[PDB]
Write a protein that binds this DNA or RNA. Structure first.
Lengths: 134, 30, 117, 70, 245, 106, 90
RNA sequence: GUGAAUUACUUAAUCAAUGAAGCGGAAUUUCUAGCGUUAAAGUUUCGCGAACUGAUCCGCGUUGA
RNA sequence: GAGUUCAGCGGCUGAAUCCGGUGCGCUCUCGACGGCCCUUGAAAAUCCAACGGAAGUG
RNA sequence: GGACAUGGGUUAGUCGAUCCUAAGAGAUAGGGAAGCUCCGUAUGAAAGGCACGAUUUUUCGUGCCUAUCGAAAGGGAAUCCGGUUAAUAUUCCGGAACCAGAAGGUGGAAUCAACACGGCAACGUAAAUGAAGUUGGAGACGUCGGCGGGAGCCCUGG
């Protein structure tokens, strides 16, 4: 039960290795296309750059832009953490069909981006948005 | 006060973050 | 305030040579020109066959001539464009050059115009 | 050293300025081999039908130098 | 009449064969971090150093002043493994493999690669299976008394360092070589010192021992400490010969 | 039939590596070939890396970028298992230094 | 039983003497034996060189410093215990 | 060569280390084979602008025997 | 279309170059392993990749 | 006749040298020595770079950290076939390739969500920016013993 919607986890395998993601929906029972206990997540690919009080507003926006990604990941490849992210506006947007039709996948990516942008500006989940160094 | 302006203090103890550039005038091989 | 334990010697202004006179009164003429590159063509039986078959002239060439200077000397002395140059130093210590002429020109007419056939 | 299975692209490389000559090969097993000398590669095309080979040959631009079996 | 084999050992073909050496085994330079605190390193790899009986450890430390990694070649102690953390300095724990000043370690501890004088990076107790024992301290004069592998007791500065534990590879001389070939191979990766021809088998020109109609020395084999380089053969300045029956 | 070295180097060495070919002229001939390439090895575990060809050093310069690496963090420098250990050990020790700091701050 | 007494030393044949070969036998069976890895428990530790003991267990791959012929020596074990008790006292 | 009532001192010379990296004074980092650099916060002036502190001052004899 | 073999003509013209099996075989190489050592078995030039994020109608 | 006389003959971006370093030789710094020269090779050396800036009192400020020689058997960019000569050929000729470097051009991709997507994953893709600094890898390695695969030769059925 420690893999719940709203829980921050780390992707340990795949292209996005070491990226912090939020559990968007858990299908631990399995599925026909994914016979294992997978969980769809939304995370960050390009973390926003560090900002300085001396920086002008245009660069502050320029560095604060964040590139998200949505992915279904195996439980064994996810590393759950104690941190939790409040996924407001992000409760119902992901479904098996949303992955089947990429137009819903593209819409989900855009909504995930705008939510991550606003949350970053709000200054919440500082650990979630800082890159993990390894 | 922008919340993104978070403090990142560096500890300069033994074994901590890299030592800052200090005045080494008395140790220079003149 | 020094942050480095080493002392590197400072950079000083380095004036360039502005001599009060020339060490040589007159600069020497180019000591390896086109006429000194090409000594005389080789007209042995093997050379003749290369003329008639490979479209290649054979010249007795100065030792210090490279493939570039041979090409320009041939172009200036004969107004023919070589497409390849192959050189060897003969066992007697003289350079021999196989100048392969372009397909537009034939070595036969070039040989007759030179007059060494 | 470059086998081409597409007729058009064989034609287009033939029209391309790098092309210098084309060659015709008539094998005993009755297939026609269109070889196209280019600057860097030699593009050859194998066709199993005579009339397609003939219509291809007349499809070559006139300026290209075509040579029969060597 | 000619200079003897001992006199020709000045260099030339008697140099150490150092083509395959895996680095000089030394402690870290005694810096501020190692004097006032401790610094942690990771044992990258334990390797065999040809011509040496003890394996060497490649411990990687972080440079406290610059963005780079320093790699130090240590004399491996028994129990060292790849990925083990090694702490060097005054506040280092008394764990096998750590480097501490001798003044910070209690009496009776077993240490190796000890410095004779603080800052020479290891002198005493380095051959395989050898170690130095902390006998006692003298805080008033800031000295430490230690027992060496030979049993000689020595006074060292209390700031001298030493690796906790015994040197790896102990028991090397416990196994007989069994044949000249094993001695041949053991000494290729060392100097040119083998095989050793006796002086009695030489001639009067070749050695003081040589000559005669029989293989006899002809004079006492204990020579004075004051003898000339060509005379100094046999038992030099021997205080007592023979077996302890 | 018997063959000879094409070059002036006798004494088969590591650089004098040869192959037998039969030519369109029905000739048995040597072909002087180069040494074999090596798959890049992992930096931490030393295992050869997966997804990269085995080429000589300079021959790696002709490849495309994606043909010499793997799309992952440290991809093309560390194996997947090595990277996974890097990630989990990094995160776990970071949580410790946080929990040690919270312990010592009070 | 192919050899009743000589054991691994049978390769040396009749040379080198009986006693000078028996001590090699004890040392050589120690040197070539497989030892249980302290980190993974798999019986996969084998000597590499004099003093080096490498574990070939997939996922362990740990190298160890030890004795010339055996992984752990009595002198090293005594030193480890005495240093442990000294540290605990200190 | 300098002192003190037999001893001290170090600048002569000797030795040893280094990348001559933190010396002498005062004021007041240890359950893990990970990464650690191109200062950011704070405080004043005019956008990764400057300046001060972050990173105390003093002495200067590179340190140790 | 080359090389090779063969049949003809006075340089030229005809054919054929095909279909398969085998191995404690030799030569070289390659792969996966094994044993040996108080012996553990070069360097550098060169080339690549990664962590990091300077910077940025065009 | 390898004799004697007269002539002719050796063609390379791809084969070597050249480049690299090995053991080792060896100038410079310095110190010896009446000297010839000796010792020395990052040593008791001021041993050389790099970037920012309206241009800085139009007299420059601010930061950032090792020679050379030495291998035609070691390391190493890239060439094969057929043919030709009285004598040369991986060098010439015919055909067919390859590597290194340079410049702009066509076509394609990414881009105002600046720096592509897919796969649970191991990883894949025709592309998919990355300074300084750090780090990893290839180059890069003994020996013997069988076992398996390949190529050439050998054997063999039409």
């Amino acid at each position: 039960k420690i893999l719940k919607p709203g829980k921050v986890a780390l992707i340990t395998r795949g292209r996005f290795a070491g990226k912090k993601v939020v559990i968007l929906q858990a299908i631990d029972q399995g599925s026909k296309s994914h016979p294992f206990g997978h969980a769809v997540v939304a995370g960050v690919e390009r973390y926003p750059l560090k900002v300085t009080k001396s920086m002008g507003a245009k660069r502050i926006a320029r560095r604060s832009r964040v590139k998200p990604f949505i992915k279904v990941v195996n439980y064994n490849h996810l590393m759950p953490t104690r941190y939790a992210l409040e996924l407001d506006n992000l409760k119902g947007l992901i479904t098996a069909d949303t992955f089947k039709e990429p137009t819903q996948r593209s819409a989900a990516r855009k909504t995930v981006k705008k939510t991550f942008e606003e949350k970053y500006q709000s200054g919440k989940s500082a650990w979630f948005f800082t890159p993990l160094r390894f | 006060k922008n919340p993104l302006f978070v403090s990142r203090p560096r500890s300069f103890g033994i074994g901590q973050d890299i030592q800052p550039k200090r005045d080494l005038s008395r140790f220079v091989k003149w | 305030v020094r942050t480095s334990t080493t002392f590197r010697r400072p950079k000083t202004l380095q004036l360039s040579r502005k001599p009060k006179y020339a060490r040589k009164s007159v600069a020497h003429a180019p000591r390896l020109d086109e006429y000194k590159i090409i000594v005389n063509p080789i007209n042995s039986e093997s050379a003749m066959k290369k003329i008639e078959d490979d479209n290649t002239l054979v010249f007795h060439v100065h030792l210090k001539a490279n493939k570039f200077t041979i090409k320009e000397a041939v172009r200036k002395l004969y107004s023919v464009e070589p497409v390849k140059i192959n050189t060897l130093i003969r066992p007697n210590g003289t350079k021999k050059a196989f100048v392969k002429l372009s397909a537009d020109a034939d070595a036969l007419d070039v040989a007759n115009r030179i007059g060494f056939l | 050293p470059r086998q081409i299975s597409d007729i058009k692209q064989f034609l287009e490389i033939a029209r391309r300025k790098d092309a210098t000559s084309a060659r015709i090969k008539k094998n005993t097993n009755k297939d026609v081999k269109f070889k196209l000398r280019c600057s860097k590669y030699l593009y050859t095309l194998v066709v199993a039908d005579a009339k397609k080979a003939e219509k291809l040959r007349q499809s070559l631009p006139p300026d290209l130098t075509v040579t029969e079996v060597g | 009449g000619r200079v003897i084999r001992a006199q020709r050992k000045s260099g030339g073909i008697f140099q150490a064969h150092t083509r395959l050496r895996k680095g000089a085994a030394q402690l870290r330079t005694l810096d501020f971090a190692e004097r006032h605190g401790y610094i942690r390193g990771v044992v990258q790899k334990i390797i065999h150093d040809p011509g040496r009986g003890a394996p060497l450890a490649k411990v990687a430390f972080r440079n406290p002043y610059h963005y780079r990694t320093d790699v130090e070649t240590f004399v491996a102690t028994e129990g060292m493994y790849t990925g083990q953390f090694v702490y060097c300095g005054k506040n280092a724990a008394l764990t096998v493999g750590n480097v501490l000043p001798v003044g910070e370690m209690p009496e009776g501890t077993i240490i190796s690669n000890v410095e004779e004088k603080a800052g020479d990076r290891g002198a005493l107790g380095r051959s395989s299976g050898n170690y130095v024992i902390i006998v006692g301290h003298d805080v008033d004069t800031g000295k430490t008394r230690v027992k060496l592998p030979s049993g000689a007791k020595k006074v060292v500065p209390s700031s001298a360092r030493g690796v906790v534990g015994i040197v790896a590879g102990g028991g090397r001389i416990d196994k007989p070589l069994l044949k000249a070939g094993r001695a041949f191979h053991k000494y290729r990766v060392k100097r040119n010192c083998w095989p050793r021809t006796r002086g009695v088998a030489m001639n009067p020109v070749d050695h003081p021992h040589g000559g005669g109609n029989h293989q006899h020395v002809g004079h006492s084999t204990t020579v004075p400490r004051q003898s000339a380089p060509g005379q100094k053969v046999g038992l030099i300045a021997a205080r007592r010969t023979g077996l302890l029956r | 039939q018997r063959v000879t070295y094409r070059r002036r180097l006798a004494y088969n060495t590591r650089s004098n590596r040869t192959r037998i070919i039969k030519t369109p002229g029905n000739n048995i001939r040597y072909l002087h070939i180069k040494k074999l390439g090596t798959i890049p090895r992992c930096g931490d575990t030393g295992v050869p890396l997966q997804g990269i060809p085995a080429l000589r050093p300079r021959e790696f310069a002709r490849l495309s970028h994606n043909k010499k690496t793997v799309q992952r963090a440290y991809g093309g420098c560390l194996s997947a298992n090595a990277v996974k250990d890097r990630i989990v050990r990094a995160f776990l020790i970071e949580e410790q230094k946080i929990v040690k700091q919270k312990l010592k701050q009070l | 039983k192919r050899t009743k007494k000589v054991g691994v030393t049978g390769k040396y044949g009749v040379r080198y003497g009986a006693s000078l070969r028996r001590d090699v036998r004890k040392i050589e069976v120690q040197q070539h034996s497989r030892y249980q890895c302290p980190f993974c428990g798999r019986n996969t530790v084998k000597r590499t060189a004099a003093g080096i003991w490498c574990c070939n267990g997939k996922g362990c791959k740990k190298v160890l410093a030890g004795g010339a012929w055996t992984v752990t020596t009595a002198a090293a074990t005594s030193a480890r215990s005495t240093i442990r008790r000294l540290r605990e006292m200190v």
